[PDB]
Design a protein around this ligand. Structure first.
Ligand code: HEM
Length: 461
């Protein structure tokens, strides 16, 4: 039979068992009642939820081909079954694989690219002149430009209009997709798609991001030189000129825009948010910032640009960089998976096409691995001798068949960037540390941090 679960109602299914402002909290609640694997009908879509590390691991790692489907996500129909993030189609495996190699090869690697970005990041910060600013569209430019170098060999000035416009759309999409109305819509799309509302803005934003990618792509083709891949959208293009004679093609001008649109969005927004969350966290705990400042100076000093080698001798920072990703559970319910095959899991039948949800928050806040998981504590990642302590539970990028395609870059960005920033600036907040409320203001697709301002105070002059 199916995993156990509350008894669904006609039409709405299990919707009264779900707080829409906070699906993950409902999941945790249902997990107290029914254990680590359970069934939910939301609207008429059947859903199995895995909660806790044993169940989440097994699902992601033991059943790595039965659960490598991508659950549907209506707001993103313009990407469905193409690109990487949202194809559940035939076409995902190789587009993904190829995309992975290409990033590795552009990884003049990832450390220079990031390091060179840092120079413009630090400049923009200098330019705020210790006045109050909203960092959301200052610090975001940096992962935006890095992904944009790989993708288009393009580099944007920190206030070129289309630049700001792109980031803005990424940011609105991640925000909106974390709101109640978008959770309902994503599960009741036919009932709700032609009513007014928030879903339309997301759809219009998705389309707009595609148009801008689309053009960059037509432009790349119209001056393509197969001896010279200038970037990643080149390498995909080349891969399409190869197989033009074949009856089975898996590359489409539309497919390539999706692929790139995907990498652009994902490569910009999760990293931006995490950094922006970090700055708010470090500002709540001035003593943690302080320990950080003295460690940078000791190991790197006020001048020399940070570099990945510096990590293995910076155990506090490495602990902090991880604890920020653990504490915030940025994509708390993972992205949805679905069953490719009628599957048996702990003796339960999971019917093909069942959406499968390997919960990440429930792993990152394991009471056992991370005593006081609700509290931000770098020692969650320090052994009793002050050294870095790794955890099998550090899973904010998921794992297995659909693991983030960007994990390496992401992790490199968080450490070098958070290193740069702190090397040159003191963070300072416009309210007491005592008063910063770290709670996300929406929870769905993502965990979204409160809007805030800060000042950055130079350390070198
Ligand atoms: C802190 C930053 C990031 C976090 C927390 C994050 C997290 C995730 C998560 C949870 C998933 C879905 C996992 C699954 O389905 O099993 C994912 C998928 C993905 N990520 Fe990220 N990601 C981040 C940064 C990036 C970056 C920088 C890129 C681009 C270089 C990227 C590209 C993707 C893509 C294309 C997928 C789709 C996976 C697939 O279906 O094949 N992500 N990421």
């Amino acid at each position: 039979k199916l995993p156990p679960g509350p008894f669904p109602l006609p039409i709405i299914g299990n919707l009264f068992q779900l707080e829409l402002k906070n699906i993950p909290k409902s999941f945790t609640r249902l997990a107290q009642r029914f254990g680590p694997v359970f069934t939910l009908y939301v609207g008429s879509q059947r859903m199995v939820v895995m909660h806790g590390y044993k169940a989440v691991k097994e699902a992601l790692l033991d059943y790595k081909d039965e659960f490598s489907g991508r659950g549907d996500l209506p707001a993103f129909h313009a990407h469905r079954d193409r690109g990487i993030i949202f194809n559940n189609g035939p076409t995902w495996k190789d587009i993904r694989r190829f995309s992975l190699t290409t990033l590795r090869n552009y990884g003049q690697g990832n450390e220079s690219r990031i390091q060179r970005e840092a120079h413009f990041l630090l400049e923009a910060l200098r330019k705020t002149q210790g006045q109050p600013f909203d960092p959301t569209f200052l610090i975001g430019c940096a992962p935006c430009n890095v992904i944009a170098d790989i993708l288009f060999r393009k580099h944007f000035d920190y206030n070129d209009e289309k630049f700001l416009r792109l980031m803005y759309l990424f940011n609105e999409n991640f925000h909106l997709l974390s709101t109640p109305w978008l959770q309902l819509y994503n599960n009741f799309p036919s009932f709700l798609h032609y009513l007014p509302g928030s879903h339309r803005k997301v759809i219009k934003n998705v389309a707009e991001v595609k148009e801008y990618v689309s053009e960059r792509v037509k432009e790349h083709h119209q001056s393509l030189d197969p001896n010279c891949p200038r970037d990643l959208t080149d390498c995909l293009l080349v891969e399409m000129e190869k197989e033009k004679h074949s009856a089975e093609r898996l590359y489409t001008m539309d497919g390539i825009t999706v692929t790139v649109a995907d990498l652009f969005f994902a490569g910009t927004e999760t990293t931006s948010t995490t950094l922006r969350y970090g700055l708010l966290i470090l500002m709540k705990y001035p003593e943690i910032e302080e320990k950080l400042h003295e460690e940078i100076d000791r190991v790197i000093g006020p001048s020399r640009i940070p570099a990945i080698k510096d990590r293995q001798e910076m155990p506090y920072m490495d602990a902090v960089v991880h604890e920020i990703q653990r504490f915030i559970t940025l994509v708390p319910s993972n992205l949805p998976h679905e069953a490719t095959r009628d599957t048996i899991f702990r003796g339960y039948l999971i019917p093909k096409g069942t959406v499968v949800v390997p919960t990440l928050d429930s792993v990152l806040y394991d009471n056992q691995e991370f005593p006081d998981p609700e509290k931000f504590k770098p020692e969650h990642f320090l052994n009793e001798n002050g050294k870095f302590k790794y955890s099998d539970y550090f899973k904010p990028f998921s794992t297995g068949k659909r693991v983030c395609a960007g994990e390496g870059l992401a992790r490199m960005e968080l450490f070098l960037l958070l290193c740069a920033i702190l090397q040159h600036f003191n963070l300072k907040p416009l309210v007491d540390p005592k008063d910063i409320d770290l709670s996300p203001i929406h929870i769905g697709f993502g965990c979204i941090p409160p809007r805030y301002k800060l000042c950055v105070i130079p350390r070198s002059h």
